[PDB]
Amino acid sequence: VCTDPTQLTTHAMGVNIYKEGQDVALKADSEYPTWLFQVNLGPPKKLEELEPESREYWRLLRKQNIWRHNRLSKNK
Amino acid sequence: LREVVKTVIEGRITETPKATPDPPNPSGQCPICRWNLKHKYTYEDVLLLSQFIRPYGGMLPRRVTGLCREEHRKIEECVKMAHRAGLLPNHRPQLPEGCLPKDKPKLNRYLTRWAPKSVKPIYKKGHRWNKVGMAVGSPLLKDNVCYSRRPLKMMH
Amino acid sequence: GVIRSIVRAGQAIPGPPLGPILGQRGVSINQFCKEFNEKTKDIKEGIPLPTKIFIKPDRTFELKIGQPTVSYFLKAAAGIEKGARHTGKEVAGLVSLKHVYEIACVKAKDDAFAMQDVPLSSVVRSIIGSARSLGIRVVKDL
Amino acid sequence: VKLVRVQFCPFEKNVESTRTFLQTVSSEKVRATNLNCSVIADVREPCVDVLFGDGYRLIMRGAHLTTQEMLSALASHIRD
Amino acid sequence: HFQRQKLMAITEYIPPKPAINPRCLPPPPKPPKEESVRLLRQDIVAVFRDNRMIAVCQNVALSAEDKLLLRHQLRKHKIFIKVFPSQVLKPFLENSKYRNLLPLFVGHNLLLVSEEPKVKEMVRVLKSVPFLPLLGGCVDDTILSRQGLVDYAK
RNA sequence: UUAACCAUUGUAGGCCUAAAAGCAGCCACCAAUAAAGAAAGCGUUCAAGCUCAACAUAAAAUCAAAAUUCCAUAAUUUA
Ligand code: FES
């Protein structure tokens, strides 16, 4: 497999590795839509980071609510 | 009130008789509150108790009655005492198909807090300082108005 | 009854982990491996694949397979075969952001795993979360 | 129970008892238990008819009947 | 001593009796209602406004992942399964374009939200499973039955 | 708080573990979804699997009065 930093950053080594599919080269950054590289790469959105008017905020809050019960349930 | 008629079976909801108009104390959340009857009913008051009891002596659900929990416990105890005292001849238990009662002499009892079946005899009465006390009445009815000089002797 | 296994296509008869477990419900062990071998030929051998076999009470096989795991690939991409004991804080490899997205695009092709979401935020979080499970730190650029 | 027929009219005044009862009939677990049943949502006052091969037919109207009573009556018929 | 025991009883505090017990009190004022749930209002408001006709079919214990696939399946049909908890569905009419659809939205049932008059696509969804009770689609945000939906889905 | 109902998909996630998949150890601890805890008690050749929390849908609101033979009798309301 590829072991070259230049090839790793200039060719899509991990896109396809099968025998029938050959490693395809990386197109220019402008050749892809902006949203491809603009996705959230940071840490998970915390309750502070999460927008109170976003669905993810309450969805993760419900997960946090489940966590509280689980913590209590574990001790029982 | 829903009744089922009977294979094809059909059920009809029928209108129910309404309470007498102009309750003595409107704005009362519970019917006992509405009628100023909080501390003036006893197990002897079968007429009031019968309204909340099934035809065979079963207790009606509290939600249907609408009365508060405190009265529910009091009314339930009062009804149970009346049944044990044989004050509800028309609300006796239902005979399933053809069963008949014990057909043995029935002892007259009243003011019975608990069922006679589950109360064991007190063989050792005790001495003056060790005398055993026998409960009479119900704690749920402590708040009822008393017309005696001193509170009634619950424990005999 | 849905039974999910991640066994590598290279070996179609591991034995205890697949054979008797499916057999306990009552199935033909040989039939399961043969169909698994059929999947093995299409895919590269020795790479874990998630399967979604459904063992109904009627003693039938409903084998469904999808894209190769991104958890093992991230380990391979990081040059790690056996990870650290904990992996919560231990890190042995770093994955560039560009590499992260390239694999995600191919991931969004199966009818299983919910690989039809238009936004790539869902896809990246799963692999980002998977990387956290592994002894790998996903750096934006290295 | 080979067939169960449940209907009600959402546009007109629709009784919840029959609607909730239909959902229980049209349940994956319930359908498996009475596998012989042929379920049909005749939603379109409410009339419910269940047909048996032996010729026993029970017709239930949910306008004055609660969902539980239909379930108890129909469920008892299943044992036969 | 007997006298000492008398003192202990005397220390007992004498409490006054309230006029009426809290349960038997006259109906008193209660804390004002607060919309906690507020986020979900925007989600339902946007989708209902976007989609004129909302086909309705009581969910037959469907699993969550299937809805994701069904969302994509409807995306093939150019429709979306945008549904949300029904506890906040009832206050939808309280704060939304309409206020009279509460009886229609009785119970928790699948909401199929479509903005385009692609009748064939909508029916095909109905062709997947008819056994679940399908109330009908509120064509142009108007109350319709199952048969009414057919009479007006055209 | 505490009464009814249900439980999808990623990832059997990395760890000496043959294998341990929420649930031997061990990890950090994210996603989609309307709602799913990278798991809370169960089950565990390992898993399948039982439920609790999820979502929907119920309905509530500060402690009391050992060996001879039981041992006054009784008793809840007229100021
Ligand atoms: S007398 Fe008013 S609630 Fe009981």
Numbering used by the authors:
A (entry chain l): 58 to 133
B (entry chain r): 35 to 40, 47 to 196
C (entry chain J): 18 to 159
D (entry chain k): 13 to 56, 61 to 96
E (entry chain I): 41 to 76, 79 to 150, 155 to 200
What's written in the study?
S-adenosylmethionine (SAM) is the principal methyl donor in cells and is essential for mitochondrial gene expression, influencing RNA modifications, translation, and ribosome biogenesis. Structural analysis by cryo-electron microscopy demonstrated that SAM-dependent methylation is required for peptidyl transferase centre formation during mitoribosome assembly. Our cryo-EM analysis of the mtLSU from SAM-depleted mitochondria reveals ten distinct assembly intermediates demonstrating how methylation can orchestrate mitoribosome maturation.
States A1-A4 are the earliest mtLSU assembly states identified here, characterised by an immature central protuberance (CP) and an A-loop of H92 held by an MRM3 dimer, which would typically methylate G2482. These states exhibit a relatively low overall resolution (4.6–7.4 Å) which is sufficient to trace CP maturation and the dissociation/recruitment of assembly factors and mitoribosomal proteins. Here, we observed four sub-states (A1-A4) with bound MRM3 dimer, which differ in (i) binding of uL16m (as A1/A3 mature to A2/A4) and bL36m (as A1/A2 mature into A3/A4) at the base of the L12 stalk and (ii) maturation status of the CP coupled with the dissociation of DDX28 (as A1/A2 mature to A3/A4). It is thus likely that in the absence of uL16m (states A1/A3), H89 becomes disordered or displaced.
